[PDB]
């Protein structure tokens, strides 16, 4: 599976998941009422979404654009 990465450390970019991991991720972090941190990847699991931890997953190629 190849997913979208993007975070503190990649300028958004394409990532080949380490085996295992069969989940592309798109991820929004709640940091005040203006600012949020949004980060993409490979996961192995989903956890479920909540209002300050908002996260979709897929398992599709780039399917987390």
Same mark, same amino acid.
């Given at each position: 599976? !190849?997913?979208?990465?993007?975070?503190?450390? +990649?300028?958004? !970019?394409?990532?080949?998941? #380490?085996?295992?991991?069969?989940? %592309?991720?798109?991820? +929004?972090?709640?940091?005040? #009422?203006?600012?949020?941190?949004?980060?993409?990847? %490979?996961?192995?699991?989903?956890?479920?979404?909540?209002?300050?931890?908002?996260?979709?997953? %897929?398992?599709?190629?780039? %399917?987390?654009?």
């Amino acid at each position: 599976l !190849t997913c979208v990465k993007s975070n503190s450390i +990649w300028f958004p !970019t394409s990532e080949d998941c #380490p085996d295992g991991q069969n989940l %592309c991720f798109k991820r +929004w972090q709640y940091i005040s #009422p203006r600012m949020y941190d949004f980060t993409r990847g %490979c996961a192995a699991t989903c956890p479920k979404a909540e209002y300050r931890d908002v996260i979709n997953c %897929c398992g599709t190629d780039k %399917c987390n654009k």
